[PDB]
Amino acid sequence: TPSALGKLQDVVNHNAQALNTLVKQLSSKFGAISSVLNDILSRLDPPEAE
Amino acid sequence: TNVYADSFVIRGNEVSQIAPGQTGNIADYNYKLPDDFTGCVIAWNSNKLD
């Protein structure tokens, strides 16, 4: 029966899922024109890119 | 505490270069404003005087 260590499996599964979603949150656009800081710095002026 | 007044005459259309985070001929060769600049900019037409 492989479902005996389900709790210990789900612990690390939730940990990996939290890590993955924390990594994916970097691709989010929190009201900005792009998710990359270098692109915003190269496109807009510092007063507007702030 | 310490207030300083600068005086210079440009060709008119270059007024956008006198600002923090701006680039150009005058901004990079003649007069540059820092990103942490705290002051006021006063510019008016002088086609009748200069």
Token readout for B22 is: 């701006």
Cα gap A23→A38, rounded to integer Å: 18
Inform me whether the C-beta atom of residue A44 falls under 8 Å from chain B C-beta atoms.
Answer: no
Method of determination used here: cryo-EM
Contact between B39 and B19 (Cβ < 8 Å)? no
**Cα–Cα distance for residue pair B27/B19, rounded to 1 Å:** 8
Nearest CA to CA, how far is A25 from chain B (Å)? 29
- Closest chain B C-alpha to A50 CA, distance in angstroms: 11
Among chain A residues, CA nearest to B22:
A45
CB atoms within 10 A of CB B21: 17
CA–centroid distance for B50 within its chain: 17
Give A9's contacts (C-beta < 8 A, 6+ positions apart).
none
Smallest CA–CA distance, residue A14 to chain B, in Å, is 44
Report CB contact under 8 Å: A45, B35.
Answer: no
CB B14 within 8 A of CB B26: yes
For this experimental structure, what is the resolution in angstroms? 3.8
Joined tokens for residue A35: 């998710």
Residues A49, B4, B6, B12, Cα dihedral to 10°: 40
Size of interface A-B (CB pairs under 8 A): 8
User: What is the rounded CA–CA span in Å between residue B40 and residue A38?
Assistant: 29
